[PDB]
Amino acid sequence: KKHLFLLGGHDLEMQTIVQILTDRNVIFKDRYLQWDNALLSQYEEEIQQYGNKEPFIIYGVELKEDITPPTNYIRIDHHNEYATYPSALEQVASILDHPLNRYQTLVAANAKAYIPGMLEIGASHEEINLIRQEDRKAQGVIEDDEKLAQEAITNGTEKIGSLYVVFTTANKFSPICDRLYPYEKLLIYTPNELIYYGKGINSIQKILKRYTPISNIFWGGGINGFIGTVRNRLTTNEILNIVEQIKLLEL
Numbered sequence: 159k160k161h162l163f164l165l166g167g168h169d170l171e172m173q174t175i176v177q178i179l180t181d182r183n184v185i186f187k188d189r190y191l192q193w194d195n196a197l198l199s200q201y202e203e204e205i206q207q208y209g210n211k212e213p214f215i216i217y218g219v220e221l222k223e224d225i226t227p228p229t230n231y232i233r234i235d236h237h238n239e240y241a242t243y244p245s246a247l248e249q250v251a252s253i254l255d256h257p258l259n260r261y262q263t264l265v266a267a268n269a270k271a272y273i274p275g276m277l278e279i280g281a282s283h284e285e286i287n288l289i290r291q292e293d294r295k296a297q298g299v300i301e302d303d304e305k306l307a308q309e310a311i312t313n314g315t316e317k318i319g320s321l322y323v324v325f326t327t328a329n330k331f332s333p334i335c336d337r338l339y340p341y342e343k344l345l346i347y348t349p350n351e352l353i354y355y356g357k358g359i360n361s362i363q364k365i366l367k368r369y370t371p372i373s374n375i376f377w378g379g380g381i382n383g384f385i386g387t388v389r390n391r392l393t394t395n396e397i398l399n400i401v402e403q404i405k406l407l408e409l
C-alpha cells in the first residue's frame with residue numbers, strides 16, 4: 159500500500175512533517191497552507207487522481223473535510239474529537255516507522271501542549287526558546303505581529319482571578335502567549351475572534367456551544383489546551399458576550 163500525504167496549515171510541526179516526508183521519499187503535496195485555509199478542497203486535484211484508487215492510502219494531515227473524502231482517505235489530526243490524540247508529527251512518524259529525534263520530540267510536545275509539554279520532556283531554556291521562535295516563524299509571524307503583541311500586553315490586558323483577558327487587533331496570537339507565559343488561563347479576543355488557552359477548556363466549550371454551532375469551534379489538547387472560534391463567524395457582540403461568560407467562571 160502506497161502512501162499519499164496531504165498537508166494542512168503550516169507551523170513547526172507541519173514544517174517538521176515536511177522534512178521527514180521529504181527525507182523518506184513519500185508522495186506528499188504541500189500547497190503551503192495556513193491555519194485558516196487548511197481545506198481538503200485545496201487538494202481537489204490530488205483527491206481526483208488518487209481517490210478510490212486501490213494502491214494508495216491518502217493521509218490528510220489536519221485538513222477540514224469541506225468536501226467528502228474518498229474511501230481510501232485517513233484523517234490525521236489532533237483536534238476536536240481527535241483532540242486527545244498524539245500530535246500529527248507523532249502519528250505521521252508512526253505510519254512511516256520514523257524514530258523521532260530529540261528536536262522532533264520537542265516539536266511534537268510544543269504542538270500538543272505548548273511550553274508545558276516541553277518542560278515535561280526535560281526541555282532546557284534554550285531548547286524552549288528555539289522551538290517557540292521556529293514555531294512562530296513557521297506560522298508567518300513577523301515584526302508587525304510582535305509589535306501589536308507588545309501593545310496588547312501593555313495596554314489591553316487585565317487579570318480576573320487566574321485568567322488573563324487580552325483584547326487585540328492582532329492577527330496571530332502566539333506572540334502574545336509567549337510574552338505572557340507562564341499563565342494558568344489566557345483569553346485573547348478580537349472584534350470577531352477569540353481563542354482560549356489554559357485550564358478547563360471543556361467548560362469553555364459549553365459556553366461557545368450556546369452561541370455558535372460546533373462547526374465554528376476548534377480545540378486541541380487536554381485541560382491546559384486551547385479552544386477557539388473561527389474568524390468572522392461571530393459578531394462583535396457575540397464575542398463580547400462570550401468574554402463575559404468566560405470571566406464569570408472566575409467569580
Ligand SMILES: Nc1ncnc2c1ncn2[C@@H]1O[C@H](COP(=O)(O)O[C@H]2[C@@H](O)[C@H](n3cnc4c(N)ncnc43)O[C@@H]2CSCC[C@H](N)C(=O)O)[C@@H](O)[C@H]1O
Binds near residue numbers: 169329353389
Ligand atoms: N496552552 C497553550 N497556550 C499557548 N499556545 C499553545 C497552547 N497549547 C498549544 N499551543 C500552541 O498552539 C499551536 C497549536 O497548533 P495547531 O494544533 O496546528 O492548532 C492551530 C490550528 O490548527 C487550529 N485551528 C483549527 N481550525 C482553525 C481555523 N479555522 N483558524 C485558525 N486556527 C484553526 O487552532 C490552532 C490555532 S489557534 C489561534 C489562531 C490564531 N488566530 C493565530 O493566528 O495564532 C501550537 O503552535 C502550540 O505550540
